[PDB]
Design a protein around this ligand. Structure first.
Ligand SMILES: Nc1nc2c(ncn2[C@@H]2O[C@H](COP(=O)(O)OP(=O)(O)OP(=O)(O)O)[C@@H](O)[C@H]2O)c(=O)[nH]1
Ligand SMILES: [Mg+2]
Ligand SMILES: [Mg+2]
Ligand SMILES: [Mg+2]
Ligand SMILES: [Mg+2]
Ligand SMILES: [Mg+2]
Ligand SMILES: [Mg+2]
Ligand SMILES: [Mg+2]
Ligand SMILES: [Mg+2]
Ligand SMILES: [Mg+2]
Ligand SMILES: [Mg+2]
Ligand SMILES: [Mg+2]
Ligand SMILES: [Mg+2]
Ligand SMILES: [Mg+2]
Ligand SMILES: [Mg+2]
Ligand SMILES: [Mg+2]
Ligand SMILES: [Mg+2]
Ligand SMILES: [Mg+2]
Ligand SMILES: [Mg+2]
Ligand SMILES: [Mg+2]
Ligand SMILES: [Mg+2]
Ligand SMILES: [Mg+2]
Ligand SMILES: [Mg+2]
Ligand SMILES: [Mg+2]
Ligand SMILES: [Mg+2]
Ligand SMILES: [Mg+2]
Ligand SMILES: [Mg+2]
Ligand SMILES: [Mg+2]
Ligand SMILES: [Mg+2]
Ligand SMILES: [Mg+2]
Ligand SMILES: [Mg+2]
Ligand SMILES: [Mg+2]
Ligand SMILES: [Mg+2]
Ligand SMILES: [Mg+2]
Ligand SMILES: [Mg+2]
Ligand SMILES: [Mg+2]
Ligand SMILES: [Mg+2]
Ligand SMILES: [Mg+2]
Ligand SMILES: [Mg+2]
Ligand SMILES: [Zn+2]
Lengths: 236, 108, 19
RNA sequence: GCUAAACCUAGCCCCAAACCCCACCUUACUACCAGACAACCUUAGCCAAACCAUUUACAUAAAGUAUAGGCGAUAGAAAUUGAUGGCGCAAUAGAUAUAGUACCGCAAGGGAAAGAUGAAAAACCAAGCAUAAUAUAGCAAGGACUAACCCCUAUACCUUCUGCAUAAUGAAUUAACUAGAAAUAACUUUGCAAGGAGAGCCAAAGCUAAGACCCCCGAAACCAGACGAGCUACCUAAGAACAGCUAAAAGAGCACACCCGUCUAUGUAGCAAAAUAGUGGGAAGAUUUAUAGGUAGAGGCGACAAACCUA
RNA sequence: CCUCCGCAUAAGCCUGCGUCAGAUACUGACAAUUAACAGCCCAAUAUCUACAAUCAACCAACAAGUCAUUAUUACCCUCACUGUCAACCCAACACAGGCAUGCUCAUAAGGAAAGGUUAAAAAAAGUAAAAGGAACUCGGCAAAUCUUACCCCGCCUGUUUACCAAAAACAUCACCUCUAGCAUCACCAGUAUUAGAGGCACCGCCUGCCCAGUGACACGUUUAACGGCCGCGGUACCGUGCAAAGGUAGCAUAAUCACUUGUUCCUUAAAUAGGGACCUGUAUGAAUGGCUCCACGAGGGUUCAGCUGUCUCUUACUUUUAACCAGUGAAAUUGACCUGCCCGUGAAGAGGCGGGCAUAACACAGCAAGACGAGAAGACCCUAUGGAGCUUUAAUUUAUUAAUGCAAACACCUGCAUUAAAAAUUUCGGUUGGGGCGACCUCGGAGCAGAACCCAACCUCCGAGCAGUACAUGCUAAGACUUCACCAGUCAAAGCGAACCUCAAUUGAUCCA
């Protein structure tokens, strides 16, 4: 096939980017994932998951102003247009994030624990134990990859050594270098879990094609499986 | 239903040469005393009828020329006058159709 | 199973001939 | 006496010898702009083994020997030896070929037919019918007879079968075409003869040579490589359509266009290789639909109907 | 008189009803469609571009949306090329089909249902119909009217076998199970309130017990995984066995094996129908989801009332068809036919044969009893050491992936093993009172088969797949028998060497080990 990924943009921007649906088809053209196809046309809004990204020629902790909080078609959680210095950028909005709020992004790990305030980004080592976090990075400077869905909140359990233990929303524990940044509070759109589709048409709008009509026998995997919680996933 | 066997040429000849199939000789043909062409007794002579039809066509073309358009039928009688002929007292008050030829002998 | 035998068209040249 | 009949050369087959202006990869046949992308990788299967599973061929002589082999079907060496046309075709033949054209298919691809005067054109015969329809009764004829019929006798053919007039198969009919290939061992006839044969091989009358016996059409299939998503299944890009009324931001109701195809009738070689008329379901949505692109057969796609993927 | 239309653009086609001349909407020649409409575009490098649309204004949103530049550097000096026709395309055709868009919404544009006659049957379309009003029929199919109420299934809108099934099947919101801690080609430019693999099916009440077995996960757990959820003795409850638990709630003659038309009440004059019930199911039953229920359905039943030609019971008329006249002109089929009826016969249903009867010749229009009529080398059934699809817990494999372990190298790659996943190749014996099921398949004895031999049966009856004794139960060798072939199986003189086999069957080749 001649499939070329629409994700060719190289420069970050605030403008919604015109996407191209895949319908679950790989670059070879064959279906790789079923149940995807159609739905309302959407435009991608480039999200800056590296919350501590000091502006060019600048460094150190910096503040920003929340211009607005906007529904994002590409994400369960709604996003926020956060502007600082002479730049703007899309970020993941926390639960109680309103327009006009001030958001602090710092890389400083003080000897004491910073007073956690919802919406700000601090290194995990700077947070008090037990604070609710989101948009956690696997490695320092990698960028947020975990706890990004609507209403998801990780927990800061321990800060042994130069490492921090994070309870992910799936309850799995995660060891990360304390220098990696994570935002305070739970992700916005907390009531996303209580959304009623109502009609098959709404699923088709969202872009989920109906399940296959073929009847499958349920094997040994089907029965409820109670397992011990998996061990910590370490990144040190 | 389809034929169970081919019908022979003998049977076919019987069927298609049975006198019911054959054309019947017509004994009602006769010579027209006027022109001498053949005509069926009850039917009008083809030659004479064609003469009359052609003269009628000429007269009707003159009628159309005089009328000059559709829906202009006269409200008076019509008389056809040929070369060398003048309207009579009866012809007075009637639309005159002039034909540029001698009156046919059969026409009166 | 459904049985269908597609019609077979005779070549056009056979019937297109002219004096 | 009409359809028609014929015809001889266009060419072809097998051998020998010999080695063989401009435009055009973009939507080919399109004068004229920054590329970068580059090829190599065991054939398989049918089939035989009466299945199928290891397996199953792709000069002479040694020799069908050594060997291999579900040691079986079958496979099978080497050393060594020495090494100038036609008892062809002649227009259903011979090349498919007058031409890879016409035509058919989206494409890969399939694939025809035929012509006949003469030195000069600046010169009686197939079927089918008609001449000429038919006379009681009968496998259509035979014995006959003065006499066509009338009289008497007579259950078409082929194949298949225990057995067929069989109401079992095939056949309208004419013309043309259309189907028994060969080893071993024997037999017959020659030649020579304990030897024969123009190296090799055989031999306790054999050896050498010749003659003479082994068909045609037909599957569903299997595998390899191409070609196909202009139909249809689904998807991608960017478009278009949805009157009117009730209701009110509705996978809402009635209802056009539009999409579909519930039931009836007709049609069933049809207008149509799935239609027509009426009737009916939806008709602002999970809708319908124009354009271009994508997924390819050990596959794709599928609101699974084993659906659809050029009837 | 009709008008579905029609006129343009798109797409498609490619000169395909313009003129002249010849023929007999054809052939040859000549001519033609003129760009403004449309196509054919853009110099770079960076840098910008949160705020739909819907009369965009209130409003209401969700499915979150077609519409934008700047900065510097370059640069004008010189309107080409191509489509333009038509009665047109895809359907083998001048095919009643397919065919996007803008206007026209019945037309200003575009067309002609009747070749002529007659007015037979049968057939098609339509209209009208006395009295009755479903008495028709499987069924109110069709037609006519506009019409109530109760059930089953599915919640619903949707989807499906293009070309016999539109459904109760598939999907479906909702609920639930399982898997996954993660980024530069899908999932996803997403991150556990996410994504994927599934089951069931909105909602309401619920979803009972069981982990013994299989599977899966773990190093015991799991059933909203595959699945399962009882007896005995005594006279419902009193004791006992067994099991993992003994089917719980609910519903129940069900779309639920049979009994079946279950038994009753209602409904009808009459009901194998329908509805309501039952000590109604050892073959009901709970996300293999159970009950209830609002709406909805061309789904399947039943029904009030009306309606009507469905019918009692058919009739009349118009059109088409039809028949006749004219033109043009197929198809399957066809051994030949000089092609009768009755009875009998026969390859077990005669036009053709035997005995009777009948019998001038041919047309035309109807009919469908026969020509075992045409049509498709029957799709039913069997067979073939003929296929293919699918499933596996059929045989053979792991070449291929995924894991591991061992080497090799210092995670990857390579080689070797093991385990899974996925697959691949191939087969699915025979006899048989058709096939299947059952039984049988080899050997011996007795009858059938009385007397040389031999004789079938899914015929009648018995048995065998050893055992015992001996260790010359060694070696050789004439001649014979022979299970109707061969293979195999038998007996045996003489001789050497010695001493001084029983038994009816009591078994199995080759290759290969
Ligand atoms: N067997 C055979 N002989 C041929 C063939 N063609 C040609 N010849 C022979 O060639 C010889 C010479 O032919 P010519 O035509 O007379 O002479 P050429 O042209 O010098 O001959 P080539 O060198 O063979 O071309 C004659 O003996 C021919 O018969 C062929 O096809 N087969
Ligand atoms: Mg399902
Ligand atoms: Mg074989
Ligand atoms: Mg064979
Ligand atoms: Mg050699
Ligand atoms: Mg030829
Ligand atoms: Mg003749
Ligand atoms: Mg007969
Ligand atoms: Mg016969
Ligand atoms: Mg037969
Ligand atoms: Mg026949
Ligand atoms: Mg397409
Ligand atoms: Mg509307
Ligand atoms: Mg609606
Ligand atoms: Mg099914
Ligand atoms: Mg099926
Ligand atoms: Mg007409
Ligand atoms: Mg007529
Ligand atoms: Mg009446
Ligand atoms: Mg009745
Ligand atoms: Mg009634
Ligand atoms: Mg009745
Ligand atoms: Mg009806
Ligand atoms: Mg439904
Ligand atoms: Mg529906
Ligand atoms: Mg579909
Ligand atoms: Mg169908
Ligand atoms: Mg359909
Ligand atoms: Mg249907
Ligand atoms: Mg269902
Ligand atoms: Mg009834
Ligand atoms: Mg006629
Ligand atoms: Mg009889
Ligand atoms: Mg007749
Ligand atoms: Mg019959
Ligand atoms: Mg028949
Ligand atoms: Mg047959
Ligand atoms: Mg076989
Ligand atoms: Mg013997
Ligand atoms: Zn006259």
């Amino acid at each position: 096939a001649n499939f070329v990924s629409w994700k060719s943009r190289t420069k970050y921007t605030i403008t919604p980017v015109k996407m191209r649906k895949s319908g679950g088809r790989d670059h070879t053209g064959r279906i790789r994932v079923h149940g995807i196809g159609g739905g309302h046309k959407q435009r991608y809004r480039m999200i800056d998951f590296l919350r501590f990204r000091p502006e060019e020629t600048k460094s150190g902790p910096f503040e920003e102003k929340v211009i607005q909080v906007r529904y994002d078609p590409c994400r369960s959680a709604d996003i926020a247009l956060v502007a600082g210095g002479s730049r703007k950028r899309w970020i993941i909005a926390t639960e109680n994030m309103q327009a006009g709020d001030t958001i602090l992004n710092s890389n400083h790990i003080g000897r004491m624990a910073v007073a956690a305030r919802e919406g700000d980004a601090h290194p995990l080592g700077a947070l008090p134990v037990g604070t609710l976090i989101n948009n956690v990075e696997s490695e320092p400077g990698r960028g947020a990859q975990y706890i990004r869905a609507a209403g998801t909140c990780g927990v800061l359990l321990r800060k042994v050594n130069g490492t921090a233990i994070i309870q992910l929303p799936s309850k799995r524990q995660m060891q990360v270098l304390e220098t990696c940044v994570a935002t305070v509070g739970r992700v916005s759109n907390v009531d996303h879990n209580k959304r009623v589709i109502g009609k098959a048409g709404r699923n088709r709008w969202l872009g989920k094609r109906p399940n296959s009509g073929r009847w499958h026998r349920k094997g040994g995997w089907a029965g409820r499986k109670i397992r011990p919680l998996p061990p910590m996933k370490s990144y040190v | 239903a389809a034929p169970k066997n081919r019908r022979t040429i003998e049977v076919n000849r019987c069927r298609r040469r049975n006198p019911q199939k054959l054309i019947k000789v017509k004994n009602n043909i006769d010579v027209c005393p006027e022109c001498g062409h053949l005509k069926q007794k009850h039917v009008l002579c083809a030659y004479c009828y064609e003469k009359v039809c052609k003269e009628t066509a000429e007269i009707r073309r003159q009628i159309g020329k005089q009328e000059g358009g559709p829906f202009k039928a006269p409200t008076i009688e019509t008389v056809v006058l040929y070369t060398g002929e003048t309207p009579s007292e009866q012809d007075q008050g009637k639309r005159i159709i002039e034909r540029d030829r001698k009156r046919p002998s059969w026409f009166t | 199973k459904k049985r269908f035998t597609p019609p077979i068209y005779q070549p056009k040249f056979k019937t297109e001939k002219e004096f």
